[PDB]
Amino acid sequence: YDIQAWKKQCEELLNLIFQCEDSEPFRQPVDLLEYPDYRDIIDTPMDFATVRETLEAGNYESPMELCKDVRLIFSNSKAYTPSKRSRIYSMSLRLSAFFEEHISSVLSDYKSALRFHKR
Ligand SMILES: Cc1cc(Cn2nc(C)ccc2=O)on1
Numbered sequence: 748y749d750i751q752a753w754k755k756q757c758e759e760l761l762n763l764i765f766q767c768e769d770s771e772p773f774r775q776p777v778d779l780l781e782y783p784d785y786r787d788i789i790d791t792p793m794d795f796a797t798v799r800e801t802l803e804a805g806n807y808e809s810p811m812e813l814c815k816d817v818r819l820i821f822s823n824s825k826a827y828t829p830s831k832r833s834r835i836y837s838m839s840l841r842l843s844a845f846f847e848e849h850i851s852s853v854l855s856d857y858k859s860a861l862r863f864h865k866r
Pocket residue numbers: 772773777782823824827828835
């Protein structure tokens with residue numbers, strides 16, 4: 748029932764994501780010089796360095812907020828892909844499965860801890 752435990756758990760999961768080869772296209776903001784129409788398709792760019800920085804700055808109140816930003820990385824990849832068979836989009840689907848597999852217990856533990864706090 749540790750209300751704060753999610754933060755270190757998210758730091759560790761981000762470290763695992765950074766060591767994954769599938770995260771390479773998502774580690775830094777999408778290069779607007781290489782994809783000049785990116786902002787015509789994507790309203791809110793997101794990447795894993797921005798997520799890690801937001802977490803380290805103490806600018807996430809809960810793992811749900813972190814999860815919303817990570818999911819935005821994947822939805823942006825899906826929205827920008829010209830094909831569901833593209834390399835970057837295919838990497839995003841594997842990385843998303845890995846993320847969802849690991850974030851589930853973090854969210855469950857946090858919500859359980861908060862319910863215990865308000866019992
Ligand atoms: C994340 C992310 C990276 C890209 C942009 N992109 N990158 C390459 C190498 C080829 C096609 C292409 O669309 O789009 N979202």
